[PDB]
Amino acid sequence: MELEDANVTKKVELRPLIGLTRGLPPTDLETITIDAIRTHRRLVEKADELFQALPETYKTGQACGGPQHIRYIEASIEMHAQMSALNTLYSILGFIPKV
Amino acid sequence: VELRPLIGLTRGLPPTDLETITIDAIRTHRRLVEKADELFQALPETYKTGQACGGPQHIRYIEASIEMHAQMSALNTLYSILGFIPKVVV
């Protein structure tokens, strides 16, 4: 499928994705990755929106702890974890698809 | 540490909140394993033996598995940051 960036500084970070995707038809690996890209972008947007809605004392470090902060931290954890998977998919695919 | 960004992200968070997040992360891991397991069990036998692969249903199982593996890497990181795996009643 259309490419964004060829030759990636590949890093399989999530070992089990190799077995999971071994044997898949190319188009299905592509579908999975494109969907992961879109999930990636939504997760980033969520995390960033939560960070911005934080009271200004939280951003600066003044404040910390508490539900709201925890919700932000959880959304960022989801984003970082899913980005690991996305990087792994790029490694397996060999390129970064254009979306 | 499997997911290095988590160290910076959690720096300064009170220990109680860290431990609450990690306990919720165990619950989440257990739910994600359960879902992956449900989807695998529902796959046609050809796919459960690895004779066949691909198609939407198989894709949905792979995506559930990917979710589970990515979350687990977060959870293992949380353990390292916290210094322990908390007791969780299951």
From Swiss-Prot, chain A:
Disulfide bonds: none
Purpose of the protein: Negatively regulates conjugation and the expression of tra genes by antagonizing TraR/AAI-dependent activation. TraM may either bind or modify TraR or AAI making them unavailable. Alternatively, TraM may bind tra promoters preventing TraR activation.
Single GO BP term: negative regulation of DNA-templated transcription
Name of the coding gene: traM
Annotated keywords: Conjugation, Plasmid, Repressor, Transcription, Transcription regulation
Protein name: Transcriptional repressor TraM
InterPro entries noted in UniProt: Tscrpt_rep_TraM (IPR015309), Tscrpt_rep_TraM_sf (IPR036336)
